[PDB]
């Protein structure tokens, strides 16, 4: 509607009502779907004026309009977000969290979410300015259901950004301060609150075992497993990420996931029509089969080996690569009986067919698993029985062709295989 030129004229008028009308006009310009003129507004020098309007407690309308305008500037590129921070906006927005007007405090929540979402530095800067205490105070009600639903979703999303990003991860004391509120939100019945809570938990568990432990010790794994079975893709996706993260930790952290019943949802996850769900579920499997023999046994007992055979047989190639890793981890740590069971489920033929892949890493992984299965066969005396199985499905052709392959590890291992199990 208005031109930037006219907005500037109104803002510079030193007439509060004229300034309000011009700030609202800026807000509407910045709120249009078609390429908002953010850089034009910044170049006109308006950010410092918007920031000063955030402090006009006597004129809450101009606080709201300035907050909205600045929110949308901070929603753009890093350099645009930086312009808002450089104008002094962080402490001004934190001051607005205590506004008696819900729509104004909500806009400050939103703006701080955008600023913290830029990256690690601005996230930690929002924290150093003291955003966490007043953010959490807005949620200190006995039942979250009494809060307005849009208000609650905005607070959850902003808290999730305070949990987001690495190098560095969020300060340990900030995480520990936020976590109990996060756990409340993870048990709330709104699907958008649930999704962003799950995302927050997935960020917190994307790191070293000490960070996983701080989440797992709050008892959220059962709720994560429940959400793993949700019908809403926007909930299953972060729930699976968080579960996947947790099983990259210690065998005891992985056991909590198994204890909570996660493996029973993997028949559905490993056949999920959404390829990134299948991929992440198979990746998660590969870190469970890297565990203890008793954890491999629970994978067996839940009937999941046929599902791994399936994904190896037919899936998106990235998923098939995760399955190859799941099998190599299984054969690396499993008992002889567990490895025998894997052959009886049909692993050999799909394993052999993937030796035709161009990818050099997957060849080594598959060759490594064939090795581990042969070592199981040696312990039993059936090395030749296995060599005919690999022969019958056209496998021997592939290991044979592979000793003349560019890779050192591929040529060495494939030749070692030919020499030890396919000779006179």
């Amino acid at each position: 509607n208005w031109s930037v030129e006219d907005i500037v004229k109104g803002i510079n008028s030193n007439n509060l009502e004229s300034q309000l009308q011009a700030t609202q006009a800026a807000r509407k310009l910045l709120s249009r779907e078609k390429q908002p003129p953010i850089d034009n507004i910044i170049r006109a020098g308006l950010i410092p004026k918007f920031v000063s309007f955030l402090g006009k407690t006597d004129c809450s309308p101009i606080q709201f309009e300035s907050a909205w305008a600045l929110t949308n500037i901070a929603s753009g590129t890093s350099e645009q977000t930086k312009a808002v921070v450089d104008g002094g906006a962080i402490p001004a927005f934190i001051s607005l969290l205590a506004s008696p007007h819900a729509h104004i405090s909500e806009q400050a929540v939103w703006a701080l979410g955008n600023i913290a979402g830029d990256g690690s530095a601005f996230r930690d800067l929002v924290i150093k300015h003291g955003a966490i205490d007043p953010l959490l105070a807005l949620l200190a009600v006995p039942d979250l259901s009494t809060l307005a639903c849009g208000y609650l979703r905005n607070l959850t999303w902003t808290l999730s950004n305070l949990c987001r990003n690495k190098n560095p991860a969020p300060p340990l004391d900030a995480v520990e301060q936020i976590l109990p509120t996060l756990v409340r939100l993870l048990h709330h019945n709104d699907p958008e609150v649930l999704a962003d809570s799950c995302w927050a938990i997935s960020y917190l568990t994307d790191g070293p075992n000490e960070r996983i432990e701080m989440v797992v010790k709050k008892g959220v794994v059962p709720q994560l497993v429940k959400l793993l079975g949700a019908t809403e893709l926007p909930i299953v996706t972060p729930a699976l990420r968080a579960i996947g993260n947790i099983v990259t930790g210690t065998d005891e952290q992985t056991q909590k996931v198994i204890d909570a019943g996660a493996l029973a949802v993997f028949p559905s996850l490993l056949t999920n029509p959404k390829t990134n769900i299948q991929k992440e579920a198979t990746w998660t499997m590969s870190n469970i089969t890297a565990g203890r023999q008793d954890q491999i046994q629970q994978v067996v007992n839940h009937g999941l080996v046929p599902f791994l055979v399936g994904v190896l047989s037919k899936a998106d190639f990235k998923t098939q690569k995760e399955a190859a890793w799941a099998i190599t981890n299984y054969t690396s740590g499993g008992t002889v009986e567990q490895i025998v069971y894997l052959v009886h489920c049909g692993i050999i033929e799909p394993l052999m067919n993937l030796l035709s892949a161009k990818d050099t890493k997957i060849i080594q992984v598959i060759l490594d698993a064939i090795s581990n299965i042969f070592q199981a066969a040696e312990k039993l005396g059936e090395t030749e029985k296995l060599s005919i199985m690999i022969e019958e499905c056209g496998g021997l052709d592939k290991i044979e062709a592979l000793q003349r392959h560019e890779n050192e590890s591929v040529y060495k291992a494939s030749l070692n295989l030919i020499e030890k199990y396919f000779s006179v």
């Binding site: 709120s31 249009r32 779907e33 908002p36 909205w68 929110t71 949308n72 901070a74 929603s75 753009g76 977000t81 806009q107 939103w110 979410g113 955008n114 979402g117 830029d118 999303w157 950004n161 987001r164 962003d196 995302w199 997935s202 960020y203």
Partner: peptide
């Protein structure tokens, strides 16, 4: 991961 930034188009 989801979008770190949200514009209010309202």
């Amino acid at each position: 991961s989801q979008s770190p930034r949200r514009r209010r188009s309202q």
